[PDB]
Amino acid sequence: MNIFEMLRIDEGLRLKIYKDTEGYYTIGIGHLLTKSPSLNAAKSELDKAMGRNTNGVITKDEAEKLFNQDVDAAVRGILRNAKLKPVYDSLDAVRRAALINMVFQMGETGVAGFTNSLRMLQQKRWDEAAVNLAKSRWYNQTPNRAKRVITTFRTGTWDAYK
Ligand SMILES: [Cl-]
Ligand SMILES: [Cl-]
């Protein structure tokens, strides 16, 4: 299992514009287009992203291409972030994936706000962090997904995705 496979499970794959769990226009593999309520604004951003007139629809290949860029960006966001980097560096390979997932879903900023959990993860206090992570909007809004990531941090294994 790896980051790609993992996120692909959490996000799914859609070829037509859609609304995410928060009601934002998205496409592909969890690629957010825009927070605006306007579909046109969405279509616009999409075309700009694909370099072509999509008419709100892309191919698998294109989705995958977005997905690659989005993963890379996330890693890079982590690495450039002063609060994130050190955490990420302290972790093992599976757990890193877990950090990446959260960043992909919520943004480097969103993640950097779990200050307390971050600190616990850094100290390798697995059960405590799991508990702290759960006290969050994130967990309350997307419980199944949150559970999977959290188990991942807790165990350092892929069991939740098997
Ligand atoms: Cl983009
Ligand atoms: Cl969920």
Q: What is the CATH number of the domain that holds 110?
A: 1.10.530.40
161 close to 2: Cβ distance less than 8 angstroms: no
Domain count along the chain: 1
Output the CA–CA distances (angstroms, integers) from residue 54 to 32, 74, 86, 107, in the order listed.
Answer: 16, 25, 40, 26
131: nearest Cα among 111, 147, 108: 147
∠11-46-72 over CA atoms, to 5°? 50
Side-chain half-sphere CA neighbours of 89 within 13 A: 8
How many Å apart are CA 4 and CA 74, to the nearest integer?
A: 12
The approach used to solve this structure was X-ray
How many Å apart are CA 160 and CA 155, to the nearest integer?
A: 9
20-28 — which CB contacts under 8 Å span 24+ positions? 21/141, 21/142, 22/141, 27/56, 27/58, 27/63, 27/66, 28/58, 28/62, 28/63, 28/64, 28/66, 28/67
Give the Å distance between the CA of 1 and the centre of ligand 1: 26
129 close to 120: Cβ distance less than 8 angstroms: yes
Give the Å distance between the CA of 152 and the centre of ligand 2: 15
Q: Residues forming the annotated binding site for substrate?
A: 32, 104, 117, 132
DSSP letters of 17-61? EEE-TTS-EEEETTEEEESSS-HHHHHHHHHHHHTS--TTB--HH
Measured in angstroms, the resolution is 2.1
Specify the amino acid at residue 80: R
Q: Which structure tokens are listed for 26?
A: 């998205």
The set of residues, in sequence order, having a beta carbon less than 8 Å from that of 62 and lying 6+ positions away, is 28, 50
How many Å apart are CA 162 and CA 95, to the nearest integer?
A: 16
Q: Which structure tokens are listed for 28?
A: 């592909």
Domain region containing 57: 1-162
Ligand with the closest atom to the CA of 46: 1
134-139 — which CB contacts under 8 Å span 24+ positions? 138/102, 138/106, 138/110
19 close to 26: Cβ distance less than 8 angstroms: yes
> Of the residues 20, 47, 64, 128, which is catalytic?
20
Helix axes 93-112, 143-155, angle to 10 degrees: 130
Which pairing describes strands 14-19 and 25-28: parallel, antiparallel, or unpaired? antiparallel
Backbone angles phi, psi at 34, to 5 degrees: -165, 155
Helix axes 60-80, 3-11, angle to 10 degrees: 110
- Is 20 one of the annotated active-site residues of the chain? yes
DSSP letters of the chain? --HHHHHHHHH--EEEEEE-TTS-EEEETTEEEESSS-HHHHHHHHHHHHTS--TTB--HHHHHHHHHHHHHHHHHHHHH-TTHHHHHHHS-HHHHHHHHHHHHHHHHHHHHT-HHHHHHHHTT-HHHHHHHHHSSHHHHHSHHHHHHHHHHHHHSSSGGG-
- Is 47 one of the annotated active-site residues of the chain? no
Q: Which structure tokens are listed for 130?
A: 């799991």
